[PDB]
């Protein structure tokens, strides 16, 4: 009903492109982009909106004079006339204005720090039905005003920017109980053994195996649940509510065409009943939607979740590498109300890095493959600055800790370093980078060389 600090919300409009409610939600990228863009929510039945790069945390809601006083150096409820510290839920960065242009307008994006008036956002409602100083609730559209630039959060044409004109902004809650299935969570799947997807050098990894061993702990066994319910998508999971399913590691979607097989496909193939899956307590064919965070229905380690597609009514079981291929059977065995275990935060964080890692380098490799032609002279599709920006971030992401750290903290930073090296090993991303060393060892400085001017420093 109400909005406090540490809530999970999104920002959305429907940009009217020739009488079309273009349902665009705000999405910064992070770890490879300091800029922001939009994600379509219009064709959510067939084109799945991403969510994890779109949610936000209201870290604080202070007044004006208190913020200016603290700038000289509980769960507080939202009030119109307060400056808030918005924070990207995935990247951990804070939403701020940027000093670039895409007019005296300004760009928006994330940043590392939190000081300065860039990351601060005072709120004003553009509706006479409510007024200043009172509480902000669900469905309260507003104008969000910058503090540094003193501009409004402008939506342009498609430019999310900071200009001297205003645009309304819908706010929809996502979430607000430990040991329970929460929407958007990343989780393992206990089988004996666990559900797994095959390793790299691909198949295009599109098959499905059941396996125990070290790859249960390791990268490929990661699953982020997503519902079709756009608002309140971080609510507590109950039985029979609809799920899509995106694979975390490969960046694909677990789709089902019972005509062919269990499919591992992209966004646009993942339609409604291509992948509408649910969970049941028994294996029989016996709510629908709640405007809240709901009740905690399913536990983690003590749970019997029977997977079933809505569109075909089948029940997933193994067949008879350990290749017990999970196929949507009509009945299956009694080993299909499986058990769960969630993963942790930096585990999910690196996993979300990896599928954003490969989509740069594959455009970097094929960008070089287009320049591997004797005469192409038109392949502009070759990232440079997005490579270098993501490169220092990954350099920073594996930065060893200093000697000016307490030893208990330094182990945890070291233990964070070890696991994050281990996931890149059993993804074999070194070999992905190793191919970029091949395709950049051609010249001594290249191409039309003005864009490729940092060809020395990129290689170092």
């Amino acid at each position: 009903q109400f909005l406090r600090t540490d809530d999970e919300v999104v920002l959305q409009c429907t940009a009217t492109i020739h009488k079309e409610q273009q349902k665009l939600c705000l999405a910064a990228e992070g770890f490879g982009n300091r800029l922001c863009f939009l994600e379509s929510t219009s064709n959510s039945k067939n084109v799945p909106p991403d969510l994890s790069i779109c949610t936000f945390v209201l870290e604080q809601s202070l007044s004006v004079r208190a913020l200016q006083e603290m700038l000289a150096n509980g769960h507080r409820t939202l009030l119109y006339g307060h400056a808030i510290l918005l924070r990207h839920s995935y990247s951990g960065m804070y939403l701020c204005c940027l000093s670039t242009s895409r007019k005296l307008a300004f760009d928006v994006g994330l940043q590392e720090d939190t000081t300065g008036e860039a990351c601060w956002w005072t709120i004003h409602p553009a509706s006479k039905q409510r007024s200043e100083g009172e509480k902000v609730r669900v469905g309260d559209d507003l104008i969000l005003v910058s503090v540094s630039s003193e501009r409004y959060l402008h939506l342009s044409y498609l430019h999310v920017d900071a200009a001297f004109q205003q645009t309304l902004w819908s706010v929809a809650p996502i979430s607000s109980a430990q040991g329970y299935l929460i929407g958007g969570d990343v989780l393992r799947l206990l089988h004996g053994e666990c559900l797994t997807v095959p390793s790299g050098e691909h198949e295009q990894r599109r098959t499905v195996h059941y396996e125990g061993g070290a790859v249960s702990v390791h990268a490929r066994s990661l699953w982020r649940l997503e519902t079709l319910r756009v608002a309140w998508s971080g609510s507590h999971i109950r039985w029979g509510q609809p799920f899509r399913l995106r694979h975390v590691t490969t960046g694909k979607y677990l789709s089902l065409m019972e005509d062919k097989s269990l499919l591992l496909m992209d966004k646009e193939k993942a339609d409604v009943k291509s992948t509408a899956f649910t969970f049941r307590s028994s294996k029989e064919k016996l709510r629908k939607e709640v405007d809240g965070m709901g009740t905690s229905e399913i536990k983690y380690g003590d749970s019997v979740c029977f997977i079933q597609h809505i569109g075909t009514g089948l029940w997933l079981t193994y067949q008879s590498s350990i290749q017990r291929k999970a196929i949507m059977h009509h009945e299956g065995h009694m080993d299909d109300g499986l058990n769960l275990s969630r993963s942790q935060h930096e585990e999910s964080r690196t996993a979300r890095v990896i599928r954003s890692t490969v989509f740069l380098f594959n455009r970097f490799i094929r960008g070089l493959d287009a320049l591997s032609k004797k005469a192409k002279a038109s392949t502009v599709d070759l990232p440079i600055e997005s490579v270098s920006l993501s490169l220092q971030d990954l350099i920073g992401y594996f930065h060893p800790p200093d000697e000016h750290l307490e030893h208990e903290d330094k182990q945890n930073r070291l233990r964070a370093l070890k696991n994050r090296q281990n996931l890149f090993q059993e993804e074999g991303m070194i070999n992905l980078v190793l191919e970029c060393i091949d395709r950049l060892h051609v010249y001594s400085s290249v191409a039309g060389r003005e864009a490729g001017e940092s060809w020395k420093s990129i290689l170092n």
């Binding site: 200016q68 005296l104 630039s149 003193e150």
Partner: peptide, 30 residues
């Protein structure tokens, strides 16, 4: 040595990248 009075120094001059030699030179020699 103040606060936010320099913030209007930005938002003023942001709309005007300089270019003012049109105003400086081109009329002043007639």
């Amino acid at each position: 040595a103040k606060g936010e009075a320099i913030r209007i120094r930005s938002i003023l001059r942001s709309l005007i990248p300089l270019g003012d030699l049109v105003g400086v030179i081109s009329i002043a020699f007639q």
